[PDB]
Amino acid sequence: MKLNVDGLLVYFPYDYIYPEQFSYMRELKRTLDAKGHGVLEMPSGTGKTVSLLALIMAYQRAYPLEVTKLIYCSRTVPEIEKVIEELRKLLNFYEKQEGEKLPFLGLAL
Amino acid sequence: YMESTVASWYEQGILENIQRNKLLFIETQDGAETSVALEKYQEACENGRGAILLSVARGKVSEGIDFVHHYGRAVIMFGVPYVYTQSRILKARLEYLRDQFQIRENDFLTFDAMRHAAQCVGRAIRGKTDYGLMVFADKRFARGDKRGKLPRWIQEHLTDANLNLTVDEGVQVAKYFLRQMAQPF
Amino acid sequence: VRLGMMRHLYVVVDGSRTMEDQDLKPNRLTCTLKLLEYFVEEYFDQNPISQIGIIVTKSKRAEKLTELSGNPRKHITSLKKAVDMTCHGEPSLYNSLSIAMQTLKHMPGHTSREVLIIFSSLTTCDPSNIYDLIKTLKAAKIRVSVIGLSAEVRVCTVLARETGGTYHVILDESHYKELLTHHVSPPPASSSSECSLIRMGFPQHTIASLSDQDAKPSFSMAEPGLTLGGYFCPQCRAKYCELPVECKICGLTLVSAPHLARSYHHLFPLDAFQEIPLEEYNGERFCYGCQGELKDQHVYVCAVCQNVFCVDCDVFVHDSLHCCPGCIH
Amino acid sequence: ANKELEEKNRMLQEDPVLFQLYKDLVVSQVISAEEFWANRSDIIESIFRTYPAVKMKYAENVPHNMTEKEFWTRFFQENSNAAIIKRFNHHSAMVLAAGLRKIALNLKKSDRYYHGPTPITSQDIINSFQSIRQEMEAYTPKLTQVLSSSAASSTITALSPGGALMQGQMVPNDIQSELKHLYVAVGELLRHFWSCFPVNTPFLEEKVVKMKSNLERFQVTKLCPFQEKIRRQYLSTNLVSHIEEMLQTAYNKLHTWQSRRLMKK
Amino acid sequence: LNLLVIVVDANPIWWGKQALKESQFTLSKCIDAVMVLGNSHLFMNRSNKLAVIASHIQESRFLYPGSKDGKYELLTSANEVIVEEIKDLMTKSDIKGQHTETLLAGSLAKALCYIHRMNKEVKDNQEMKSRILVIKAAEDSALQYMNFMNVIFAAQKQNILIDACVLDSDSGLLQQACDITGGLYLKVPQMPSLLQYLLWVFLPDQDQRSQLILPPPVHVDYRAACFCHRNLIEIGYVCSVCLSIFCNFSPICTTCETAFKIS
Ligand SMILES: [Zn+2]
Ligand SMILES: [Zn+2]
Ligand SMILES: [Zn+2]
Ligand SMILES: [Zn+2]
Ligand SMILES: [Zn+2]
């Protein structure tokens, strides 16, 4: 389910995205393109991380020099544990599309 | 405040009627009691007993716990969550925000409650489009200022027609709401 | 899809206090009893070889209101009596399911065991855990299809899907008839479910041989007076007043020829008819099925006979007659 | 333990039908009774189950120089505020613990249904078809052709009870009860006799029951004619022959299947 | 009110054979008896409606949806439509040697839906008690048992009577139908006097049939036969899929193809 965002093409593992998600990625890309700090709200607790993560993965590949690393923090360790699962699922989907390992590392301190 | 409300219900037959309708759990400061009670709560929902977990909005239990399908189906916000204004530590924090950054003392105080009230009640909609209703047991929330500070997704869905539902009227619409959500897609 | 021709369904009804509340036009308990009568009367009318047994669970106790039987009149009579039931207490799903399991445990393998639970009060106080019972039900191949009333309770949600049944809720009274009416049809047999041949005997109705010569006086078999003639058995040789009744002695089902022919329409469901509003070269102004003028822009046709049927005919054919009039030719 | 003795006392008089027929098998001393059965508050209780402390107290505080009413009194009896929360969670926890004890179908011949179980030259069609075609060119003969006084009258006479097409006694009532008792008597004992008969049961343990049941059929039916003889020698009216069929047909099935057993051997 | 329906079995082969036999009884008289029977019914009360249906080896057509002779004007229209319609059906027809047995289940199916179509139209104020006065005049068709069996149950569900008045041959299947739905049965042997049977036994409506003495029901032999042989069998074996009466024990029943497991 690749998404041809206005900024670039963004891979997405799940089948469908609600219209708000379209606004989410472009809104996030706007701040990332401007390279300026910003704040945004998205209701869904689940699927927000993957949508947030999905753009970063595409953004990193498109502009690896623009962004060095991703620092995604969570309130509580019990909640960060489920977050990395979303990233792990996305990586397998993205890796499966490519068909080979990529220089991507993800871990939780 | 929770104990006083519990005690008043305990003296009256309201609490016993609630106990008959469903199991009721209360929360205490100690985490060990909360952990055991919460685990029992999750057991009640799995079975048909169901459980009414009374908690404090600012308690560590509310922020830590997450409510999903058939868990906290009808989150109830009893009164706006406010701290003891006599707390000097809060006053110093509150006073500075008025002194600098140009924020009214009441505006921030309401903002903290509105942000916190939405924090605990927004878990019922975690994901997978699992139906869940949120009831605010206070006429204050109906005020325009409170609604404005309310999150967009919760705010925009909320309409003026159901804004001031009566206790029994709110119950009836909730029963209707469950019916529509109960049926499959 | 192969269906369960012979099924033993239990209609478990909750005697919970919530049934006292009147969300519908009449009292909720009366309405279910009123409509449950339609299902009981219709249930046998579309599956004679099957048998039904009702259970009422109130005050945390499940009491068998009526045992398994093939006479809708007897079951309906209990429903009329149950109208004035106290309806005060709390249901116990474990008690209800356990009662059904005991009776249904010894049932023959060929029959398709089922249960229909009319859930009203979302609370379910039970003596023990039900998940152990749920595991037993699956090993017992009992299909539990709850029909909740004003609640999508989680406990029942797993019950229906986990056990293979279907869960539903009453949107309104009119929708209530649709839900039970769906359960009238024999639910399809799943992969786990199996089938086997069943022995049966056809009781030839007999009367006095020749002017009360070598007569066969007898009263009945479940204040019945002497009967000049009545149904006998190939093996019991017992006078049965009415059919279809399981042999009180043999244990072999007795059933007349028409009853078996009643359920054939299930085996050969009629293919739906495509709906085309415009005339589409249909030069017959009068409907073929009912010889009535079509006052609506609607038409139905088969894939073989290619005839014309109005809305009234198609609604009737797929509702009751279960066959195409002209396409028979 | 004497579990059976207690059960018999409970059903000794509570239910007449169950015990009434069981005695009849022994009234005439037919067979031993061993084969008969061998083949075939709330508030206090809630606290009893809910609060373990009350259960322990009850055992230790069993009535001794006290009264139950006094015991009932003992039931209801910032730090105090916390007690309610602890009690309800404990009470709710105890209640929760109390309730937790430790295929697409296919066919090859569908025409058979259309011509179902109910059981059962060319020029004649042409000859008949043409002849009828020219029959109705004269119509509306209703004035006289439809009916005649003779034809109509004959129909009425036939419709009379004496006529063709119209073919067309509760004297014993006290004896009815005995037959119903006998009918239940036969049904009660035939059920066990026919319980194992339909199943072949090629096993000695299951087959031994058949032999005992098969022999028991004679024993129960040995006394049957004696009761029949008394009733028959009353007025020689309203003969009861159906009751004989079950016994005689039971014999025939017994004798035939018993004979079939020898052939199988 | 009552909605009578006379499903006449106007089989040309059988009625034609009578013409060749030159017997006293003839189809024209039968239609007149139906006609007079039809007229009397409507004649009973204004609210009553009727309908007439024929049968043929090809297809069955409805014979029905000043006072020149002096009779009631309404009855005059009914006679004209029926008289002309029947002659058209009989005179005009194809030839098919393969199919020569009269069809009755199909004709009834047109009858059962007609009441339902008419039952919807009738206003809520007036309750209707419909009836079907099937007048069989030929032997039944073997291949039509299942189709005929479905219509009968539809009648019972909707409470329409089937007062079979078969003649010249006792139809074992038809006599079964009238019993299930509560309809009357009658095997008139005096065909010339057929009408007088109708005005007596069949004319009275259901609400009045009870308060009247009529010929007693004939014994109905609900025979069941194996699918091997088509011979009467008292003890039948069926499977939970085919629901098919079978002759004796088999490892697997052919019509099912099920992997039946012994035990
Ligand atoms: Zn029998
Ligand atoms: Zn039509
Ligand atoms: Zn068709
Ligand atoms: Zn055979
Ligand atoms: Zn089969």
Distance C329 CA to ligand 3 centre (A): 8
Residue B101's contacts (CB-CB under 8 Å, 6 or more residues apart) are none
C129 part of contact set with chain B, CB < 8 Å: yes
| Amino acid at the residue E188 | V
Contacts of E243 in chain C (CB under 8 A): 5, 49, 260, 263-264, 267
At B96 the three-state DSSP class reads helix
- As given in the structure block, the two tokens for residue A36 are 């300026």
Burial class (CB in 10 A: 0-12, 13-18, 19+), C282: middle
The count of other CB atoms within 10 Å of the CB of residue D162 is: 8
Plot region of E113 (φ>0 → left; ψ -120 to 50 → alpha; else → beta): alpha
| Amino acid at the residue E249 | F
* Packed helices D42-50 and D52-60: angle between N→C axes, nearest 10 degrees: 110
List all chains that touch chain A, counting a touch as 3 or more CB pairs closer than 8 Å: B
D96 part of contact set with chain B, CB < 8 Å: yes
| Residues facing B24 on adjacent strands | B52
Give the rounded distance of the alpha carbon of C95 from its chain centre. 23
At C52 the three-state DSSP class reads strand
**E positions 141-170 inside 8 Å of C (CB):** 144-147, 149-154, 157-158
Say if the Cβ atoms of D99 and C236 lie within 8 Å.
Answer: no
Contacts of D118 in chain C (CB under 8 A): 257
Residues in chain B: 185
Q: How far apart are the C-alpha atoms of E111 and E132, rounded to whole Å?
A: 8
Closest to E11 (Cα-Cα) out of E50, E65, E60: E60
Say if the Cβ atoms of E244 and D112 lie within 8 Å.
Answer: yes
- As given in the structure block, the two tokens for residue A26 are 């472009």
Cα dist from E83 to B16, E58, E235, whole Å: 82, 20, 51
Whether residue C244 is preceded by a cis peptide bond, meaning omega within 30 degrees of 0, is yes
| Residues facing E135 on adjacent strands | E8
**E positions 79-108 inside 8 Å of C (CB):** 103, 105-106
D176 part of contact set with chain C, CB < 8 Å: yes
For C197-228, give one letter per residue: b (16+ CB within 10 A) or e.
bbbbbbbbeeeeeeeeeebbbbbbbeeeebbe
Method: cryo-EM
Check: CB of residue D185 under 8 Å from CB of residue D24.
yes
Residue B44's contacts (CB-CB under 8 Å, 6 or more residues apart) are B23, B25, B50, B51, D96
The count of other CB atoms within 10 Å of the CB of residue D136 is: 16
Check: CB of residue C140 under 8 Å from CB of residue C164.
no
At E130 the three-state DSSP class reads strand
Proportion of chain E in helix, strand, coil states, percent, rounded to 5 = 40, 10, 50
D152 part of contact set with chain E, CB < 8 Å: yes
The count of other CB atoms within 10 Å of the CB of residue E144 is: 20
Distance C286 CA to ligand 2 centre (A): 8
Of D176, D187, D241, the CB nearest to C248: D187
Helix (H) / strand (E) element for D52: namely helix D52-60
Q: How far apart are the C-alpha atoms of E235 and E225, rounded to whole Å?
A: 9
The count of other CB atoms within 10 Å of the CB of residue E203 is: 18
Residue with tokens 């990586």: A91
Residue E220's contacts (CB-CB under 8 Å, 6 or more residues apart) are C205, E175, E176, E179
Check: CB of residue E89 under 8 Å from CB of residue E54.
yes
Residue with tokens 């613990």: D97
- Choose the mutation target among C2, C128, C249, C327 for the interface with D, i.e. most D CBs under 10 Å: C249
- As given in the structure block, the two tokens for residue E101 are 């047995």
Of C90, C156, C171, the CB nearest to B183: C171
Distance C110 CA to ligand 5 centre (A): 12
At D93 the three-state DSSP class reads helix
Tell me E45's DSSP state.
-
Distance E108 CA to ligand 3 centre (A): 15
Q: How far apart are the C-alpha atoms of C34 and A50, rounded to whole Å?
A: 52
Q: How far apart are the C-alpha atoms of D97 and B87, rounded to whole Å?
A: 41
- As given in the structure block, the two tokens for residue C196 are 């086997």
Sign of CA dihedral D57, D58, D59, D62: positive
The C-alpha angle with vertex B177 and arms to B50 and B64, in degrees rounded to 5, equals 45
Q: How far apart are the C-alpha atoms of A68 and E71, rounded to whole Å?
A: 106
Asked whether at least 3 C-beta pairs link D and E within 8 Å, the reply is: yes
Distance B36 CA to ligand 1 centre (A): 61
Check: CB of residue E222 under 8 Å from CB of residue E176.
yes
Q: How far apart are the C-alpha atoms of C151 and C161, rounded to whole Å?
A: 16
The upper half-sphere exposure of residue C12, i.e. CA atoms within 13 Å in the direction of its Cβ, equals: 29
Contacts of A78 in chain B (CB under 8 A): 64
Q: After which residues does a break in chain E occur, C–N more than 2.5 Å?
A: 65
Q: How far apart are the C-alpha atoms of A35 and A67, rounded to whole Å?
A: 9
The count of other CB atoms within 10 Å of the CB of residue A96 is: 10
- As given in the structure block, the two tokens for residue D108 are 């090859």
Of D129, D154, D167, the CB nearest to E16: D129
Q: How far is D115 from chain C (nearest CA, A)?
A: 11
Contacts of C210 in chain E (CB under 8 A): none
- As given in the structure block, the two tokens for residue C54 are 């009702």
Check: CB of residue C277 under 8 Å from CB of residue C298.
yes
Among chain D residues, CA nearest to C236: D246
Say if the Cβ atoms of B26 and D89 lie within 8 Å.
Answer: yes
The count of other CB atoms within 10 Å of the CB of residue E208 is: 10
- Choose the mutation target among B1, B2, B25 for the interface with D, i.e. most D CBs under 10 Å: B25
Q: Which CATH architecture has domain B1-182?
A: 3-Layer(aba) Sandwich (3.40)
The C-alpha angle with vertex E249 and arms to E244 and E253, in degrees rounded to 5, equals 45
Say if the Cβ atoms of B24 and D88 lie within 8 Å.
Answer: yes
Give the number of the ligand closest to the Cα of residue D109. 5
**C positions 117-156 inside 8 Å of E (CB):** none
For E121-137, give one letter per residue: b (16+ CB within 10 A) or e.
ebeeeeebebbbbbbbb
Give the rounded distance of the alpha carbon of C309 from its chain centre. 30
Closest to B136 (Cα-Cα) out of B161, B157, B117, B116: B117
Cα dist from B74 to B132, C46, E15, E208, whole Å: 6, 42, 77, 62
> How many helices (H) and strands (E) would you count in chain D?
13, 0
Cα dist from D241 to B139, C214, C239, whole Å: 86, 8, 12
- As given in the structure block, the two tokens for residue A56 are 């970063």
Check: CB of residue D99 under 8 Å from CB of residue C126.
yes
Q: How far apart are the C-alpha atoms of C329 and D34, rounded to whole Å?
A: 66
- As given in the structure block, the two tokens for residue E220 are 């109905």
Sign of CA dihedral B139, B145, B150, B154: positive
Check: CB of residue C17 under 8 Å from CB of residue C88.
yes
Cα dihedral C75/C81/C87/C91 (nearest 10): -20
Q: How far apart are the C-alpha atoms of C190 and C138, rounded to whole Å?
A: 12
Residue D107's contacts (CB-CB under 8 Å, 6 or more residues apart) are E242, E255, E256, E257
| Amino acid at the residue D212 | K
Contacts of B183 in chain C (CB under 8 A): 168-169, 171
Give the number of the ligand closest to the Cα of residue C302. 3
Among chain D residues, CA nearest to B52: D92
- Choose the mutation target among B61, B153, B158 for the interface with A, i.e. most A CBs under 10 Å: B153
Q: After which residues does a break in chain C occur, C–N more than 2.5 Å?
A: 222
Residue E256's contacts (CB-CB under 8 Å, 6 or more residues apart) are D107, E239, E241, E242, E244
Q: How far is C95 from chain E (nearest CA, A)?
A: 30
| Amino acid at the residue D247 | L
The annotated binding site of A for ATP is made up of 42-49
Sign of CA dihedral D224, D227, D233, D237: negative
Say if the Cβ atoms of C122 and B50 lie within 8 Å.
Answer: yes
Q: How far apart are the C-alpha atoms of D134 and D82, rounded to whole Å?
A: 108
At E72 the three-state DSSP class reads coil
Helices (DSSP H) in chain C: which residue ranges? 28-45, 72-82, 93-105, 131-139, 154-163, 173-184, 257-262, 264-267, 311-316
Q: How far is D31 from chain E (nearest CA, A)?
A: 34
Cα dist from A49 to A12, A16, A72, whole Å: 12, 15, 9
- Could you give the strand order of the β-sheet that contains C197-201, starting from the edge strand earlier in sequence? C253-254, C197-201, E235-239
Closest to A9 (Cα-Cα) out of A79, A66, A94: A94
- As given in the structure block, the two tokens for residue D142 are 């209703």
The count of other CB atoms within 10 Å of the CB of residue C143 is: 24
Give the number of the ligand closest to the Cα of residue E227. 4
Indicate the pairing of strand E235-239 with strand C197-201.
Answer: antiparallel
Helices (DSSP H) in chain E: which residue ranges? 12-21, 27-44, 73-91, 105-121, 145-158, 172-180, 194-197, 206-209
Distance E204 CA to ligand 2 centre (A): 29
Say if the Cβ atoms of B127 and A44 lie within 8 Å.
Answer: yes
Check: CB of residue C111 under 8 Å from CB of residue C147.
no
Tell me E184's DSSP state.
-
Closest to C327 (Cα-Cα) out of C289, C277, C279, C278: C289
Determine phi and psi for A5, rounding to 5 degrees. Answer: -65, 160
Q: Provide DSSP, C105-117.
A: HTS-SSSEEEEEE
Cα dist from E230 to D116, D120, E127, whole Å: 8, 8, 44
Residue A58's contacts (CB-CB under 8 Å, 6 or more residues apart) are A5, A8, A9, A10, A11
Give the number of the ligand closest to the Cα of residue C253. 1
| Amino acid at the residue A26 | R
Q: How far apart are the first and last CA of chain E?
A: 59
A43 part of contact set with chain B, CB < 8 Å: yes
Indicate the pairing of strand C143-144 with strand C168-169.
Answer: unpaired
Tell me E142's DSSP state.
G
Q: How far apart are the C-alpha atoms of E222 and E213, rounded to whole Å?
A: 26
Cα dist from C295 to C136, C272, C286, E112, whole Å: 57, 22, 9, 20
Say if the Cβ atoms of C195 and E105 lie within 8 Å.
Answer: no
Residue E200's contacts (CB-CB under 8 Å, 6 or more residues apart) are D155, D156, D159
Q: How far apart are the first and last CA of chain C?
A: 27
Say if the Cβ atoms of C125 and B49 lie within 8 Å.
Answer: yes
Check: CB of residue D113 under 8 Å from CB of residue E225.
no
Q: How far apart are the first and last CA of chain B?
A: 42
Contacts of B181 in chain C (CB under 8 A): 152
Check: CB of residue C57 under 8 Å from CB of residue C91.
yes
Indicate the pairing of strand C51-58 with strand C7-14.
Answer: parallel
Across the B:D interface, residue pairs with CB atoms under 8 Å apart total 41
Contacts of D114 in chain E (CB under 8 A): 143-147
Among chain D residues, CA nearest to C1: D104
The count of other CB atoms within 10 Å of the CB of residue C73 is: 11
- As given in the structure block, the two tokens for residue E99 are 């199919």
Determine phi and psi for D244, rounding to 5 degrees. Answer: -70, -35
Plot region of C280 (φ>0 → left; ψ -120 to 50 → alpha; else → beta): left
Residue C243's contacts (CB-CB under 8 Å, 6 or more residues apart) are C203, C231, C254, C255, C256, C259
Domain ranges for chain E: 1-212, 224-263
At C267 the three-state DSSP class reads helix
Q: How far apart are the C-alpha atoms of B182 and D208, rounded to whole Å?
A: 58
Closest to C309 (Cα-Cα) out of C328, C323, C329, C294: C294
Q: How far apart are the C-alpha atoms of C200 and C190, rounded to whole Å?
A: 25
Max CA pair span of chain D: 115
Closest to C243 (Cα-Cα) out of C48, C54, C38, C74: C48
Burial class (CB in 10 A: 0-12, 13-18, 19+), C59: middle
